[PDB]
Amino acid sequence: FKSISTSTKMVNGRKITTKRIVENGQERVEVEEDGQLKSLTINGKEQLLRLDNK
């Protein structure tokens, strides 16, 4: 079920940390560099949520 994991990487002095979260068959992903994200997708889907329409 929901899992809280990530992945680091020392890229030319750049601690790229990608967040991997596996909940209801979905893998969250967001690269973090110097306290700054550049990506944020879900199992390959750019979207947060829509409680209004589920």
Swiss-Prot record:
Entry's localization field: Cytoplasm, Perinuclear region; Nucleus; Cytoplasm, Myofibril, Sarcomere, Z line
Chain segments annotated as coiled-coil in the UniProt record: none
Tissues expressed in: Widely expressed. Highest levels in testis and brain, and lower levels in heart, spleen, intestine, ovary, placenta, lung, kidney, pancreas, thymus, prostate, skeletal muscle, liver and leukocytes. In testis, expressed in germ cells in the earlier stages of differentiation pathway as well as in spermatids. In brain, expressed at a higher level in hippocampus and thalamus and a lower level in amygdala, substantia nigra, corpus callosum and caudate nucleus.
Subunit structure: Homooligomer. Interacts with BAG3, HSPB8 and STUB1. Interacts with ALKBH1. Interacts with HSP70, KRT18 and PTTG.
Involvement in disease: Muscular dystrophy, limb-girdle, autosomal dominant 1: An autosomal dominant myopathy characterized by adult onset of proximal muscle weakness, beginning in the hip girdle region and later progressing to the shoulder girdle region.
Role summary: Has a stimulatory effect on the ATPase activity of HSP70 in a dose-dependent and time-dependent manner and hence acts as a co-chaperone of HSP70. Plays an indispensable role in the organization of KRT8/KRT18 filaments. Acts as an endogenous molecular chaperone for neuronal proteins including huntingtin. Suppresses aggregation and toxicity of polyglutamine-containing, aggregation-prone proteins. Also reduces cellular toxicity and caspase-3 activity.
Designated name of the protein: DnaJ homolog subfamily B member 6
Portion held of the full protein: 188 to 230 of 326
